[PDB]
């Protein structure tokens, strides 16, 4: 069809929760988006007629990203966020406003944390700091930042609380709860593998933020810790030394001579 | 010789540690008993 | 830049050989100094 009716159908399907229907509707839209040359916000042309469809494309891409995230499509969510990047991070005041901007950016940051790519997370944090004023004031943007800071410190008790307290505050982070909690649990397991010796399983059940003993035992078996009487016992290239260094010193002394 | 004009000069509108003082600790409360 | 065909070939190779000449002439002069002293 044409663009406008596709946008109407996308909006209606989103409001109905039919995320699969939205994902079906998106590929038809992109063809006419290319035909109208709307995917790239061409900065050479400042005509308001061109601008008025830019927020339409913003809406389309935002619904696409949300349909992806609610359908466990993190890769497609990344693609749609990349397509959205020129619209948000620009001086164009008419273009760079969205009530869903904070939600999308927070979802992207939480996804980056889930892929345990801390370097990317910090680089993009600097990017958003430079491109957004009062970054820490926004609670939605504060969520991933707080989860990174309290994880780096080690206060997982304040971090596991935040993940469980996320609940309905944003209502999309519930898709990321499992992976973030798994990352927290395996990090705590790595920390505990070296510190405690002869740790009773009853205290392990609460230390690892688990809920029932059976899952604690299963997780311990996954990490290959013995469970003797519920008392876990963790137990557990550069150069040839002397020769290479001495020979290299001799070579350096005698070559220059 | 470079003027380093890209980096502007900032505008404003026998020693190691020992930056704290012990003061008069005294602690005569031990001498009380 | 501009232009293409044979002429940029020879110009670029002349430039490369000139740089090689400069560096190696410096090295040869240094070596000749040491040789003459010894």
């Amino acid at each position: 069809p044409s663009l406008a009716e596709l946008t109407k159908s996308l909006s209606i399907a989103f409001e109905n929760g039919d995320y699969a229907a939205c994902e079906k509707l998106l590929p038809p839209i992109k063809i006419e988006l290319i035909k109208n040359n709307l995917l790239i916000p061409d900065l050479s042309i400042q005509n308001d007629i061109y601008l008025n469809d830019l927020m339409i494309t913003k809406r389309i891409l935002e619904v696409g990203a949300l349909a992806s995230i609610q359908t466990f499509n993190f890769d497609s969510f990344e693609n749609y966020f990349n397509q959205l990047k020129p619209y948000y991070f620009s001086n164009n005041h008419k273009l760079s406003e969205s009530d869903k901007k904070s939600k999308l950016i927070s979802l992207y940051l939480l996804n980056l944390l889930s892929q345990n790519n801390t370097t990317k997370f910090h680089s993009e944090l600097q990017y958003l700091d430079k491109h957004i004023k009062n970054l820490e004031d926004d609670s939605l943007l504060s969520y991933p930042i707080k989860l990174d800071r309290w994880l780096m410190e080690g206060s997982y008790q304040k971090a596991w609380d935040l993940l469980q307290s996320g609940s309905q505050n944003i209502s999309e982070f519930d898709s990321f709860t499992d992976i973030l909690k798994s990352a927290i649990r395996d990090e705590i397991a790595k920390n505990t593998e070296l510190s405690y010796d002869f740790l009773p399983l009853s205290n392990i059940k609460a230390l690892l933020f688990f809920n029932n003993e059976k899952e604690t035992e299963k997780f311990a078996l996954e990490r290959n810790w013995p469970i003797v009487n519920s008392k876990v016992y963790f137990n557990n290239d550069q150069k040839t030394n002397i020769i290479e260094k001495a020979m290299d010193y001799a070579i350096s002394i005698e070559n220059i001579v | 010789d470079d003027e380093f004009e890209d980096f502007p000069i900032d505008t404003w509108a026998e020693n190691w540690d020992d930056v704290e003082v012990d003061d008069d600790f005294t602690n005569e409360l031990k001498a009380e008993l | 830049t501009h232009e293409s065909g044979i002429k940029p070939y020879f110009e670029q190779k002349i430039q490369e050989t000139e740089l090689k000449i400069r560096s190696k002439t410096e090295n040869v002069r240094r070596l000749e100094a040491q040789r003459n002293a010894l």
Binding site: - | - | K7, F10, I14, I21, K24, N27, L31, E32, L38
Partner: protein, 41 residues
């Protein structure tokens, strides 16, 4: 024209390479003969 310049520069480079290898070998053998002459005297 340009080709002649390229070939002349190549010849100069090749002669200079000959000179460099000559000078290095002569450095080594001058060390040798300096020790020999110091001993002989």
């Amino acid at each position: 024209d340009i080709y002649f310049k390229l070939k002349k520069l190549e010849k100069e480079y090749e002669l200079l390479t000959l000179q460099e290898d000559y000078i290095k070998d002569e450095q080594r053998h001058l060390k040798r003969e300096l020790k020999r002459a110091q001993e002989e005297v």
